[PDB]
Amino acid sequence: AYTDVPISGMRKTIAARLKESVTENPHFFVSTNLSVSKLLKLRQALNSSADGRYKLSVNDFLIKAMGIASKRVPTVNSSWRDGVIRQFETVDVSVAVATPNGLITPIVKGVEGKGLESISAAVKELAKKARDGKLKPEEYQGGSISISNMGMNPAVQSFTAIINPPQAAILAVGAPQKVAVPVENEDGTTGVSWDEQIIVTASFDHKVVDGAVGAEWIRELKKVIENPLELLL
Template structure:
């Protein structure tokens, strides 16, 4: 009996996914649990395993196809098995919403053709259009009552980029999947949030000393990192300044109860931000182990979508590259702020009236000015600096 391969629900908020690439061809033998294809969401690429043994009889959704959760991706069965009826049923289910969408487009085009007509567009679609120079007033929306939605803008961007650049290139990298998701999310954030960035150098002497003490009798694979300590320091500072731990929801600024710190991790195909949940309530050892586990599984593409959801603040550390001191990190929506960490450099500073050479780490704190004003942001940063320069404060109430 044939087995359907359907679009999985990879997260509570997931409504659709995009086919990345098939790892098997039609006619190939597959085994249950064997990687069959890649499915992309707006946060991560997931490898989907075969649900049964058999032959991949039919690939229904090809690369770049977008399907709702439960949509038919392909069919596994026995050699020569008749799957005609199964494909007909799938086609009928797909045709119903397609017909409705076509009808909506006709109505939307008529509305768009009326000079002076009010353009209905979602906030996310508007931000993406403005970030990419798309004139949305001439587009036909496919949303309810002709509303222009994000997918309409994405299609317009794709059409705008369709012209082939004939210049010589040493490599052509498809702008799709995770790379495209990162690009669109960052463009949307940059366009929507009026951001301000505070830059400051912080003395790392005492934090480095504390770290050395903690790691003195610890195995190499259990040593805590500067990032681990910074995550704890940020969580502590957010307890003191809860308004920084907020999000904009419609016409409300919601100050969030949970302090969930996202930690940006670079991987070969892009960037992922797994979340340390309730970081303020976890001890340093648990935070360190969790971040190490995230990093290990991120490089193997084994993170779950839910592990990258629900963040309230992000820390992104470029210090290890040794080339960046200060930068402008892009806020990870729907969060209100992000901390960028630069390299640590030995610099002469004045300490108790005397010149001394100290390790100074660059911090870049970017925040959404719709939610956070400059003074509260400066107060948060002052608290964070005190916690870093007097790190014993991180662990006392």
């Protein structure tokens, strides 16, 4: 006793692509933990001084910090062509939107020279059009880096993702959690404080990137996130 359903035409188009990525790009992973208390405080401060114009989220902050880190270390903002390496100077980020019909790949352009409001508005307009199924092809064709977030589900601590064919890196974000940290109380002792953290995983190709480059990339991202004011410069 069982049932069989014919394979969809669109299911092979992604199956072949996924099968090509693994056999074409060696993978190596890097993990880190980020404290995001200050970022939450900033967001709360900036989401109450408004009258209804906008509303922000963590993903926009991560996108902007990604752009800055890409700028400081440009070797990740590259690509592997037939017989030559391609190096860019503009950062385009690919965001993943899930719908019952499948997974899309909206794009955001000019992140380096942009603010949070425009990024949010673009990500939401594109998410709406992706859900409503009137997306032009040029709008989801190519980027430099890809991001995935699963913070809506508290049961996902950390996970991995596959790199897209022409790209050389991808980032995966988990859900927040709480951990104990040591605090030097002014009385001259050590006490327990409760910090909130997220675990970030990055997958890199080893033909265009090396371990040290990825480690430096993670360091710049962390420095930009833990200290949020540095998002200005």
